[PDB]
């Protein structure tokens, strides 16, 4: 489907869009920072495809408290103008707040079991996302975005992120050398990455892609975690460690800057971040 006539500033071939950051990976995946995209062009492209975006979030045990702000702020900032399906995984159906949604947006509550250890609650998201990539997501959405719940949206998070497979630069380590990355370093774990390998340290709190690619990632991470469990080892940063192994070996087709995953209490507001889009609740 052809784009309509649009009036916007001409791209400047001989002017970099950012002079302070890397905006494309060495495998030619865009790194998404403010100033790299014209959202009007992208909105047109994705609306003409009638794109539906699923957003998964786990609110298990006491984390149900985070849902109200998460959903209210998602309504202000997440894929506004596009079709959205929220999927709230919880052990407490009745504790999901009644948040008023804009048109073309819906929410499903998916009841799941609560594991005792926070590590297992975090890790079993991979299994649960993979399982539902079959039950619901393949028929209901085009893309999945999988995030932590103890967060709020403060600025635009839109179709600029959508791509077959994306990860997000962890806010603690975007300026770190690979040897300093907290990858799993024990060869006995499936998540093992040697000191001389690694592109980026991706945050477990924000990843996504097409349903097919998210199914692949989440199943791979789950199956890897089950191998580790059988061998009596648990990766240093749990699902995040396995996510990082997967994305090393299967390069993402976009990488999101730390604008998309931030903690202002711990890290402030650096000049390199023109926007703080999705942030930790302090
Ligand atoms: C090196 C510079 C020294 C400073 C390093 C600052 C980042 C530390 O970050 C932790 O990183 C871990 C991996 O190594 C896990 O991803 C953990 O979930 C994360 O904590 C999370 O994200 C943080 C941003 C906070 O929101 C914290 O409350 C979260 O639990
Ligand atoms: C602080 C934390 N710790 N744990 N695990 C965490 O953020 N875990 C990742 C996500 O796992 C989910 N979670 C974790 C523990 C829990 O009791 N309930 C829950 O929903 C939330 O969606 C969290 O955002
Ligand atoms: Mn957390």
From Swiss-Prot:
Cofactor binding comment, as recorded: Binds 1 Mn(2+) ion per subunit.
Listed cofactors: Mn(2+)
Effect of residue 171 to A: In allele B(A)
Glycosites: 50
Gene Ontology biological process: carbohydrate metabolic process; lipid glycosylation; protein glycosylation
List of residues binding Mn(2+): 148, 150
Membrane topology value: Single-pass type II membrane protein
Signal peptide (residue range): none
Pathway where this protein functions: Protein modification; protein glycosylation
Cellular component aspect of the GO annotation: extracellular region; Golgi apparatus; Golgi cisterna membrane; Golgi membrane; vesicle
Subcellular location: Golgi apparatus, Golgi stack membrane; Secreted
Residues reported in the UniProt entry to bind UDP-N-acetyl-alpha-D-galactosamine: 58-60, 63, 148-150
Keyword Lipid metabolism included in the entry's annotation: no
GO molecular function, one term: manganese ion binding
Result after altering residue 100 to M: In allele Aw08
Role played: This protein is the basis of the ABO blood group system. The histo-blood group ABO involves three carbohydrate antigens: A, B, and H. A, B, and AB individuals express a glycosyltransferase activity that converts the H antigen to the A antigen (by addition of UDP-GalNAc) or to the B antigen (by addition of UDP-Gal), whereas O individuals lack such activity. Glycosyltransferase that catalyzes the transfer of carbohydrates to H antigen, forming the antigenic structures of the ABO blood group.
Domain-related comment: The conserved DXD motif is involved in cofactor binding. The manganese ion interacts with the beta-phosphate group of UDP and may also have a role in catalysis.
Record-given protein name: Histo-blood group ABO system transferase
Included stretch of the parent chain: 64 to 345 of 354
